[PDB]
């Protein structure tokens, strides 16, 4: 048992979880960033 | 809220960032304006929501 802190000191899974929401939430803030070919991008 | 030319909406306050001695105002990332310098005082001041 004391040989597994040596094999962390793995979690991929983990962090995976991490990035595939943070990505998502980069996007969808970055997307408000288009004209989607209008005369602009902002309604004021 | 306006600084000459730039247009928006939020609380204003001390900042503790250093621009260049040329830049007027920064960004966060995914690029949203998040601190000015005043003009007048040319003071960095932050923009919260």
Known sequence: I??????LSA????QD???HNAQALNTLVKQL???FGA????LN | FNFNGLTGTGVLTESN??????????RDIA?????????????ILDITP
């Open chain 1, 2 to 7: 004391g040989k597994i802190q040596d094999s």
């Open chain 1, 11 to 14: 979690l991929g899974k983990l």
């Open chain 1, 17 to 19: 979880v991490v990035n």
């Open chain 1, 33 to 35: 960033s288009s004209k």
């Open chain 1, 39 to 42: 005369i602009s991008s902002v």
């Open chain 2, 17 to 26: 960032k250093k621009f260049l001695p040329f830049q007027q105002f920064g």
């Open chain 2, 31 to 43: 690029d949203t304006t998040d601190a000015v310098r005043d003009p007048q005082t040319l003071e």
